[PDB]
Paper text:
The 6-cysteine (6-cys) protein family is one of the most abundant surface antigens and expressed throughout the [name] life cycle. This protein family is conserved across Plasmodium species and plays critical roles in parasite transmission, evasion of the host immune response and host cell invasion. On the merozoite surface, [name] is one of the most abundant GPI-anchored proteins and forms a heterodimeric complex with the secreted 6-cys protein [name]. However, [name] and [name] knockout parasites have no growth defects during the blood stages and polyclonal antibodies against either [name] or [name] showed no growth inhibition. Both [name] and [name] contain two 6-cys domains and the crystal structures of the individual proteins have been determined.
The [name]-[name] crystal structure was determined at a resolution of 2.85 Å by molecular replacement and reveals a heterodimeric complex of approximately 80 × 65 × 35 Å in size. The asymmetric unit contained one [name] D1D2 and one [name] D1D2 molecule. The crystal structure of [name]-[name] shows that both proteins interact through two distinct binding sites (Site 1 and Site 2) with a total surface area of 1051 Å2, with Site 1 and Site 2 contributing to the interaction surface with 578 Å2 and 473 Å2 respectively. Site 2 comprises of the [name] D2 domain in which its bottom β-sheet and surrounding loops form a concave protein surface that engages with the long α-helix of the [name] ID (and D bottom). Important for the assembly of [name] and [name] is a π-π interaction involving [name] residue Y264 and [name] residue F337, and hydrophobic contacts between [name] F283 and [name] residues L159 and L163. Furthermore, a region of 33 residues spanning 84–116, which includes the β-sheets β5 to β7 of the [name] D1 domain, which was unstructured in the unbound [name] molecule, was well resolved in the presence of [name], suggesting that binding of [name] possibly reduces the flexibility within [name] and stabilises the junction of the [name] D1-D2 domains.
Author numbering:
A (entry chain B): 28 to 145, 155 to 304
B (entry chain A): 20 to 71, 80 to 132, 145 to 200, 226 to 368
Write the structure that this text describes.
């Protein structure tokens, strides 16, 4: 599927009398906002992942050089999950592909099965996970509160704007994006801010205010609410019934409110 | 889960016709009703209610009341009503009418960018306004007969210095027992892990696993002046045997607790996404060593 299982599919067991190391490849080409997953090792399979912090750390090439950090190599990446089954090692990892405006590029994470044979040597059934980051052509209709020169969103804000040194913290920052059907929307907030509501794209704020309309009016897909990265993404539906307006708030005490608001025009 | 409110501050209720003003509310389990009365009479809601008095924990076991809000229990057995009377004394009406005007806060085209700004900025302060009101109400003690409002509403000191209101609630029954620990000796078995039932409970620790999106919790043995460790559970928990802010482990969580004592249960709604595995705990603390237990929670990664 969109998972590179190395235990129950793409099996990395050794065949008998093995004396050389082979390398299975699991190439995936996801679309933006989709979830990729690596299953490797278990309580009955002693496989280790490289880098053990993948996907938070990945390799930029299949040859395990130029190790890089995904927060900076693939801006926008979200929903990093890590699940363990044997103690003292984690075996199922996953994350959500972010919007990209630059050319496609791969990221790599390896998974090795190692054993010493009898001179003597050690043989490895390596499994390379090759993910291609899709390229889009228009930036996301959204707000980046972490930079005025965002590589993901259309509107951006320098920190001199979201801090209260020049303006008082009573005048908030309202970022309106207009968008239509099948459009990517989202926002990113700085690290120690909190997003209200907890499920912004499942529940937003009505323009009467303090209202979580739970979005029966606008049914959004590919909803991503990463509260660890304050990165939020979704896509408006195939058809817009009526024009709608909703908003969500990033808040931090003694700071301005950073508010993301969308007007969805009727589209088909 | 819907959220109900009966605000007797409104002119629609203060300048009404008959002498018995009545707001009616039909709730369900895990809902939350809020009651804003200028001068609470008879019983003190939501801690003590009027039957035509009883304390809410005996009527609807598993409920929590914080500030002026009742989080209904995530398990009710029988459909039950409650009543809370509010004495609108002539000048209490007049007094708040003078404060409600000072506050002064469906098909809008909003073609100009600027008028769209005003409607949103208007909606933004009602958001910011209500937040600071529940914060001030939570700081309030449990025994409070006279409602007061937070300063920095800028309301004048001159304004701070007939009708009878009755709000009546009915809440339905359900059958889904609480995924939690009940550390009190009673045979009602409202929780997944009582100690009246053997085995659920070992070495004074109650070990529960929680999945993303689930609501779990615990309720200490009842006493009037008990405490929880950490004092701010669930907002601060024990993690790796040190007091950690829960927001650093599972941001996006919700909680339903009482900051002033351990009398009421403690509920944690695990967020829609937790990224790692996390073991956390909170402890019941008492001058009675037989009433002290640890609530250990295994939070399992996933999505929802
Ligand atoms: C966020 O808060 C933590 C804890 O106070 C602090 O250590 C960290 O440096 C803060 N980060 C930023 C970007 O302010
Ligand atoms: C509430 O009760 C406590 C004792 O538990 C008492 O000290 C306090 O003064 C009371 N507050 C009011 C407003 O009656």
């Amino acid at each position: 599927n969109l998972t590179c299982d190395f235990n129950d599919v793409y099996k990395l067991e050794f065949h008998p009398n093995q004396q050389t190391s082979v390398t299975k490849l699991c190439n995936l080409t996801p679309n933006v906002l989709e979830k990729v997953t690596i299953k490797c090792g278990s309580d009955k399979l002693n496989y280790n992942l490289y880098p053990p912090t993948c996907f938070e750390e990945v390799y930029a090439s299949r040859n395990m050089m130029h190790l890089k950090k995904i927060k900076e190599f693939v801006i926008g990446s979200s929903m990093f999950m890590r699940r363990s089954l044997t103690p003292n090692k984690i075996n199922e990892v996953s994350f959500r592909i972010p919007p990209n405006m630059m050319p496609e590029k791969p990221i790599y994470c390896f998974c090795e099965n190692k054993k010493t044979i009898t001179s003597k040597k050690d043989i490895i059934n390596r499994g390379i996970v090759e993910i291609i980051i899709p390229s889009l052509n228009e930036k996301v209709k959204g707000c980046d509160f972490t930079t005025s020169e965002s590589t993901i969103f259309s509107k951006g804000y320098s920190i001199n704007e979201i801090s209260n040194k020049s303006s008082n913290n009573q005048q908030d920052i309202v970022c309106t994006v207009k968008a239509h059907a099948n459009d990517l929307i989202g926002f990113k907030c700085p690290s120690n801010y909190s997003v209200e509501p907890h499920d912004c794209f499942v529940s937003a704020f009505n323009l009467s205010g303090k209202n979580e309309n739970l979005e029966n009016k606008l049914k959004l897909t590919n909803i991503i609410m990463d509260h660890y990265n304050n990165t939020f993404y979704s896509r408006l539906p195939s058809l817009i019934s009526d024009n709608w307006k909703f908003f969500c708030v990033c808040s931090k005490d003694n700071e301005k409110k950073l508010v993301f608001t969308v007007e969805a025009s009727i589209s088909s | 889960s819907k959220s109900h409110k009966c605000d007797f501050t409104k002119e629609k209720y203060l300048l009404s016709g008959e002498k018995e003003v009545s707001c009616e509310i039909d709730a369900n389990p895990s809902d939350d009703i809020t009651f804003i009365c200028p001068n609470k009479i008879d019983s003190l809601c939501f801690h003590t209610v009027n039957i035509s008095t009883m304390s809410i924990q005996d009527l609807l076991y598993g409920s929590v009341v914080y500030g002026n809000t009742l989080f209904i229990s995530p398990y009710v057995r029988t459909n039950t009503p409650f009543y809370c009377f509010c004495n609108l004394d002539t000048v209490t009406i007049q007094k708040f009418l003078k404060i409600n005007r000072f506050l002064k806060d469906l098909k809008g085209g909003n073609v100009s960018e600027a008028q769209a700004d005003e409607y949103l900025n208007k909606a933004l302060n009602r958001f910011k306004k209500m937040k600071d009101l529940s914060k001030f109400f939570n700081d309030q003690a449990d025994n409070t007969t006279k409602l007061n409002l937070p300063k920095s509403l800028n309301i004048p000191n001159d304004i701070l210095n007939s009708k009878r209101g009755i709000m009546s609630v009915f809440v339905r029954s359900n059958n889904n027992v609480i995924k939690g620990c009940d550390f009190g000796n009673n045979n009602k078995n409202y929780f997944s892990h009582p100690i009246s039932v053997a085995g659920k409970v070992n070495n004074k620790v109650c070990k529960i696993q929680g999945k993303p999106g689930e609501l779990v919790g615990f309720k200490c043995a009842f006493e009037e002046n008990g405490k929880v460790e950490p004092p701010n559970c669930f907002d601060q928990v024990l993690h790796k045997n040190k007091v950690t802010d829960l927001k650093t482990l599972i941001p996006g969580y919700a909680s339903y607790t009482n900051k002033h004592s351990s009398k009421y249960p403690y509920y944690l709604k695990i967020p829609h996404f937790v990224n790692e595995q996390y073991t956390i705990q909170c402890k019941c603390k008492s001058n009675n060593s037989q009433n002290e237990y640890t609530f250990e929670l295994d939070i399992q990664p996933g999505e929802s």
